[PDB]
Design a protein around this ligand. Sequence first.
Ligand SMILES: Cc1ccc(S(=O)(=O)N[C@H]2CNC[C@@H](C(=O)NCC(c3ccccc3)c3ccccc3)C2)cc1
Ligand SMILES: *[C@@H]1O[C@H](CO)[C@@H](O)[C@H](O)[C@H]1NC(C)=O
Length: 337
Amino acid sequence: LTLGNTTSSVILTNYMDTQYYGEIGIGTPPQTFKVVFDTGSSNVWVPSSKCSRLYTACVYHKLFDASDSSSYKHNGTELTLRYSTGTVSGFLSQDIITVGGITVTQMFGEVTEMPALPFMLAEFDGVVGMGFIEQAIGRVTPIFDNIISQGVLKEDVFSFYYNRDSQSLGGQIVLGGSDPQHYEGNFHYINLIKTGVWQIQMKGVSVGSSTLLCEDGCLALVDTGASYISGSTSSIEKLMEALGAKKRLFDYVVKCNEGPTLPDISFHLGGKEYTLTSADYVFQESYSSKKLCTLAIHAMDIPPPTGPTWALGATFIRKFYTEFDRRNNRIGFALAR
Ligand SMILES: Cc1ccc(S(=O)(=O)N[C@H]2CNC[C@@H](C(=O)NCC(c3ccccc3)c3ccccc3)C2)cc1
Ligand SMILES: *[C@@H]1O[C@H](CO)[C@@H](O)[C@H](O)[C@H]1NC(C)=O
């Protein structure tokens, strides 16, 4: 490993507190795409010009055209990428990628099959996987590994800041460090259970004062790509019963008026209790006894080897500025500013 003295930041756009995306440029001249920087995955992908316009999602997103890039290198290896909400398929291509002033030769997937659900709901075009090569489909080197190889970065770390929805900054990713302007106090690190996944041990989940869940220990995937905090269908049923929340098809709700009275939810990670108040987990659109308010906590049965696991997504990261440490295989949390 080579360490330089550079840090690079990417400004993120906050869409509705659920999608946080920045810009990247692919090719010569650059074709720009809005992308989600996802710690839960390791592949880079954008929609392809080769995507049939019978996929409505491709009609609604920016497409990569290799015929317009002078730096494009053909590959063609097929690939399928599975996510929680849906799936995408295409083929591999290589070209130059610009990410916050860093220029890297990157192998990425050109998506030719992108389902309307969920991709018609996405404000972003593609994805930039911030995970490890162990999770990469087709064993493609992830973009951070390629940026590490350049020996420009001050430290072998990257940081996430996700702001609350407002003409302010939507969020920020720092490559090579952290930004002290966005956190308070000190970072408290949790070592990874194993290299290859941004997953840590969780010692318990408490609703109110009582350690209601994850009593004998459980897993926590720190996922920048997930909008919500998620647990198993079982865990979430217990949690929701404790909150007085009723299950809908895609979410759990409470009557808007009962939102500010909901108890604090605590997550025991390392040597600290990471607490969320109802203001941190309820989408408080109104205060009406005649309306229903959604929660930023969802059931999600993540399959093995990764799952069963809880996922600490945007709901968590908004409260806690997150540092992902590749040199020491750990994750640091600090109160976000
Ligand atoms: C069935 C399944 C496969 C994989 C996972 S995982 O937890 O291992 N993978 C997560 C990686 N991070 C993104 C998660 C996700 O699907 N988030 C929804 C989101 C999105 C973000 C990045 C990449 C794909 C999907 C999203 C999609 C469309 C609109 C709004 C948000 C899945 C769980 C369950
Ligand atoms: C695609 O890229 C991988 C990268 O190592 C390489 O092994 C493979 O042979 C490439 N395929 C083609 C057809 O260029």
